[PDB]
Design a protein around this ligand. Structure first.
Ligand SMILES: N[C@@H]1[C@@H](O)[C@H](O[C@@H]2O[C@H](CO)[C@@H](O[C@@H]3O[C@H](CO)[C@@H](O[C@@H]4O[C@H](CO)[C@@H](O[C@@H]5O[C@H](CO)[C@@H](O)[C@H](O)[C@H]5N)[C@H](O)[C@H]4N)[C@H](O)[C@H]3N)[C@H](O)[C@H]2N)[C@@H](CO)O[C@H]1O
Ligand code: NAG
Ligand code: NAG
Length: 383
């Protein structure tokens, strides 16, 4: 009854060579819930925006995805609206009034019916965030949207799921999320317990530390997976609604010139924007798990791999390059911690970045860990 929630990126199919990952590559039986990412919202009409129509519609992307339920009827196939690239301003604008919310709600219902989805994952990042086109009134109005969506889903009578991806920083929770009311309306809370550190922070660190490190201070003091999930509990979310995010990727850094200190918290060349782009994801500061293991784990690797004794995460470095991530050891530790705490399950960003080709060893090594632990785990009643 535990969840293994797998986010699927629709843009992964455009990755070159062995990086190419499509619908056919999803290891469906390893997941209980799979989420097609992303659709968006229109700026002008507050309707569902199909972001890659040639792929999603013309090449039958949405339907290929949902029709996987024929072979795997026990699995839920939903769609995510929002995501980082979508921005937050269109969503703050959409929830501003009742009329615009209901226009979106109607569009959502039409979309879900048309492409046979089992429900919707809300990924607005984030309500109430000034840095993301939000404002104070987003907190109330995001709740209104969620309540209105739930009632519409009930009226359709198909038992659709409604979930949300959420941050874990206290200031983000205060600005955007009525926790008790939201957790009541939602089937699951997908906590984005990653990207907690990165180039934007101005120092090298692992991005999903489980526990606090000595160097964690001020805003970073409770910015770890354990304290972050505890925060969601303390604000009123039941343990059996919380799903813990696991990143299948690393946040990389370019160290400052002449810096021979590779410890956690060491200064970086922030202007570089992060570590150099990897060949398949081609993104500064962002390396897929398979891009990391093919570099760090090889027999003649010149990378030095270390372990965060407090955060329970691996990091590795070579020359000016430094990356923090998750490996089988850290993932296993998090799986046991999830069961220890009694949370609803595990979530991954994203399934397309596991070692699905088995370049470094066994195929889909990370998702197999999530499946192994969660499938043998019974979610206890709310604490
Ligand atoms: N919810 C959070 C997540 O959002 C977040 O993960 C991020 O999600 C966003 C989407 O919200 C991702 O943004 C996408 O990034 C893609 C790649 O970076 C973009 O797609 C590509 O865009 C490229 C530039 O145009 C194209 O490059 C071409 O590639 C060609 C191959 O055919 C090549 O021949 C050519 O030379 C290139 N021009 C490429 O075609 C295209 N697919 C996409 O536009 C963009 N929306 C983001 O990548 C991702 N990190 C997550 C992690 O922070 O956290 C979650 O909680
Ligand atoms: C959907 O399935 C068809 C038939 O296998 C295939 O031709 C097409 O490429 C698939 N579309 C996507 C986006 O995977
Ligand atoms: C890789 O990313 C860079 C910077 O965004 C871009 O200029 C280039 O077109 C990308 N290369 C490929 C192969 O897509």
């Amino acid at each position: 009854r535990a969840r293994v929630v797998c986010y699927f990126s629709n843009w992964a199919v455009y990755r070159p060579g062995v990086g190419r990952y499509g619908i056919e590559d999803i290891p469906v039986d390893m997941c209980t819930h799979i989420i097609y990412s992303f659709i968006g919202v229109t700026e002008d009409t507050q309707q569902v925006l199909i972001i890659d129509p040639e792929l999603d519609v013309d090449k039958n992307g949405f339907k290929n995805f949902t029709s996987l339920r024929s072979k795997h009827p026990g699995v839920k196939f939903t769609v995510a609206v929002g995501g980082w690239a979508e921005g937050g301003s269109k969503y703050s604008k959409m929830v501003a009034a009742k009329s615009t919310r209901m226009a979106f709600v109607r569009s959502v219902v039409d979309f879900l019916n048309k492409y046979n989805f089992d429900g919707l994952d809300l990924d607005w990042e984030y309500p109430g965030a000034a840095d993301r086109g939000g404002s104070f009134s987003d907190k109330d109005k995001f709740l209104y949207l969620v309540q209105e969506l739930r009632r519409a889903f009930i009226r359709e009578g198909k038992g659709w799921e409604l979930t949300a991806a959420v941050p874990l920083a206290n200031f983000r929770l205060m600005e955007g999320y009525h926790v008790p009311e939201l957790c009541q309306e939602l089937d699951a809370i997908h906590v984005m317990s990653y990207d907690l550190r990165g180039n934007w922070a101005g120092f090298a660190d692992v991005h999903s530390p489980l526990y606090k490190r000595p160097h964690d201070q001020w805003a970073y003091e409770k910015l770890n997976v354990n304290d972050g999930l505890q925060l969601w509990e303390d604000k009123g979310c039941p343990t059996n609604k919380l799903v813990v995010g696991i990143p299948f990727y690393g946040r990389s850094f370019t160290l400052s010139s002449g810096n021979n200190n590779y410890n956690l918290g060491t200064y970086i060349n922030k202007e570089a924007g992060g570590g150099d782009p990897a060949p398949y994801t081609n993104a500064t500061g962002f390396w897929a798990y398979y891009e990391i293991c093919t570099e760090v784990d090889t027999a003649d690797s010149k990378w030095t791999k270390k372990w965060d004794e407090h955060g329970k995460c691996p990091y590795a470095y070579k020359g000016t390059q430094w990356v923090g991530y998750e490996d089988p050891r850290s993932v296993e530790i998090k799986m046991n911690w999830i069961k220890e705490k009694g949370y609803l399950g595990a979530m991954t960003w994203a399934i397309d970045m596991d070692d699905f080709q088995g370049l470094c060893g066994e195929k889909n090594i990370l998702i197999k860990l999530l499946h192994k632990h969660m499938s043998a785990y019974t979610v206890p009643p709310p604490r």
